[PDB]
C-alpha cells in the first residue's frame, strides 16, 4: 500500500548484473526481451518495490 518508487536516469544500465544481486528464477517481461536490454536504450527507468 506504500510502495517506494525510485527514478533512475542519466546513467549507463548494465542489466547483466541483476542476476548476481537477487536469487530469482525468471526475468519475466512483457514488451522487451531480457537478452536485448543492452543494445538499445530508453528515456527513463523506474523501480517499484513491494
Amino acid at each position: 500500500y506504500a510502495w517506494n518508487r525510485k527514478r533512475i536516469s542519466n546513467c549507463v544500465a548494465d542489466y547483466s548484473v541483476i542476476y548476481n544481486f537477487a536469487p530469482f528464477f525468471a526475468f519475466k517481461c512483457y514488451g522487451v526481451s531480457p537478452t536485448k536490454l543492452n543494445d538499445l536504450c530508453f528515456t527513463n527507468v523506474y523501480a517499484d518495490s513491494f
Binding site: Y19, A22, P23, F24, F25
Partner: protein
C-alpha cells in the same frame, strides 16, 4: 549447500532426435505384417502413414 535458491545446482539429460531421409535405424516397439496387393489398405511404412 548454503547457497541461495536462485542458483541451485540442477542436472540435464538431453534426448534430441532428428528427422532425415536417411535409412532409419532406431524405431519404437511394433509388429510387422505381410504384404497385400491391389487393395485399399492403410500402411505404416517406417512411420510414413497413409
Amino acid at each position: 549447500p548454503t547457497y541461495g535458491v536462485g542458483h541451485q545446482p540442477y542436472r540435464v539429460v538431453v534426448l534430441s532426435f532428428e528427422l532425415l531421409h536417411a535409412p532409419a535405424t532406431v524405431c519404437g516397439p511394433k509388429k510387422s505384417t505381410n504384404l497385400v496387393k491391389n487393395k485399399c489398405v492403410n500402411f505404416n511404412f517406417n512411420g510414413l502413414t497413409g
